A paper describes a structure:
TECPR1 is comprised of a central ATG5‐interacting region (AIR) and an adjacent pleckstrin homology (PH) domain with affinity for PI(3)P and/or PI(4)P (Chen et al, 2012; Wetzel et al, 2020).
However, upon reductive methylation of primary amino groups, confirmed by matrix‐assisted laser desorption/ionisation (MALDI) time‐of‐flight (TOF) and in‐source decay (ISD) mass spectrometry, the N‐terminal DysF domain of TECPR1 yielded diffracting crystals, the structure of which was solved to 1.9 Å resolution by molecular replacement with the NMR structure of the inner DysF domain of myoferlin. The N‐terminal DysF domain of TECPR1 represents an elongated finger‐shaped domain, which, overall, bore high similarity to the inner DysF domains of myoferlin and dysferlin (Patel et al, 2008; Sula et al, 2014a). The N‐terminal DysF domain of TECPR1 is comprised of a central pair of antiparallel beta strands connected via a long loop that wraps around the beta‐sheet and covers large parts of the domain surface. Mutations of W77, L88, L89, I142, K152, K153 and W154 into alanine all abrogated recruitment, while mutations of I65, M80, E134, K135, T147, T149, K150, Y169 had little or no effect. Subsequent mutations of nearby residues R76, S90 and D143 into alanine and C84 and C157 into serine also abolished recruitment. Together these mutants identify a binding site located at the distal end of the domain, that is, the tip of the DysF finger. Consistent with the zwitterionic nature of sphingomyelin, the binding site is characterised by positively (R76, K152, K153) and negatively charged (D143), as well as hydrophobic residues. Notably, W77 and W154 are solvent‐exposed and upon binding may become inserted into target membranes. A comparison of the sphingomyelin‐binding site in the N'DysF domain of TECPR1 to the equivalent region in the inner DysF domains of myoferlin and dysferlin reveals little conservation of loop structures and exposed side chains, thus explaining why the latter domains are not recruited to damaged membranes.
Author numbering: 64 to 170
The structure:
Amino acid sequence: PIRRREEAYENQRWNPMGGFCEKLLLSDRWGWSDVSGLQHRPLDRVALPSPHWEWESDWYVDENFGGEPTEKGGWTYAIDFPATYTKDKKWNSCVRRRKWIRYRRYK
């Protein structure tokens, strides 16, 4: 079976009012992006390459990070989006992201 995994990151920043939320800085990456932040990856717009592909399920969070489970929710935390991520919120974490995945299969 020929199978290909798509992924997309949901990116959030902490705000005194919203907590971790969808309000980002004008300098920040897209709220929905690839791992680099440079590519826009809204989930509903990742298309199948052709009608010969179908999705195996809906999008779901990959609750894994660095070869080990994440905490529930799949979030990882960092001081800023380009910095180093951990499964746990540190005292100086100002951002967080989680990885959504979806498999497509060829017919």
